[PDB]
């Protein structure tokens, strides 16, 4: 109601450029998590082949290791491991986390 | 009064909204064939576009009140 | 309604939208209309986008700090 009166920035008052990159290595990873598990649904009802879904997967988690160990390194672990903490560890077994985990793997919902 | 209208307000909201939906569906089903970026392009922006005013109408409806 | 409580009912419909256009470039690629690499770079960016739309929203509905 009044609570919303004028809209907002993306950026306000309170962020500093480094916060601004952050967020932007953050947007990176999402749309990594995200396009990776729209290529396994793929690659699932045979959309893609075995190569490709392969080759694909593996590009995309290369650059998300990159995004973990590059520019502002320290804060962007401590929101993705507080991220990864929170999400909906469901629907896949403790057998199976167990691989990713060790793998590196980040964690993508499959519904 | 300042009440019947709503009545027909939503209706008329709520009709231009499965217009949408379907103007959605339809272009999906038209772009049959991409040929260049362009065509890529412009097929993402005018479904995104269709897609977001669709839900606006959308979340406007269901809290009409 | 307001300015901001516009923007707000926008940026959700956004969000929405970005999925939906998504899925669709996702049932392209099923159809043989797009190939694989098209999806990853277009889906990549629409999801890109979805999470500073989601985010900017975070912000707004924040206890303002």
Known sequence: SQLFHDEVPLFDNSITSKDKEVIETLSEIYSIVITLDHVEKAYLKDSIDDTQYTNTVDKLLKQFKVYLNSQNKEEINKHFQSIEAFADTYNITASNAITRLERGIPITAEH | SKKYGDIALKKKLEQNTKKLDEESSQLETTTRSIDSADDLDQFIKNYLDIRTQYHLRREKLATWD | ?65
């Open chain 3, 1 to 65: 309604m307001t300015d901001g409580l516009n923007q707000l009912y926008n940026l959700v419909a956004q969000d929405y939208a970005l999925t939906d256009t998504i899925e669709a470039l996702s049932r392209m690629l099923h159809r043989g209309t797009i190939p694989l690499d098209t999806f990853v770079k277009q889906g990549r960016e629409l999801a890109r986008q979805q999470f500073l739309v989601r985010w900017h929203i975070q912000r707004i509905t924040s206890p303002l700090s």
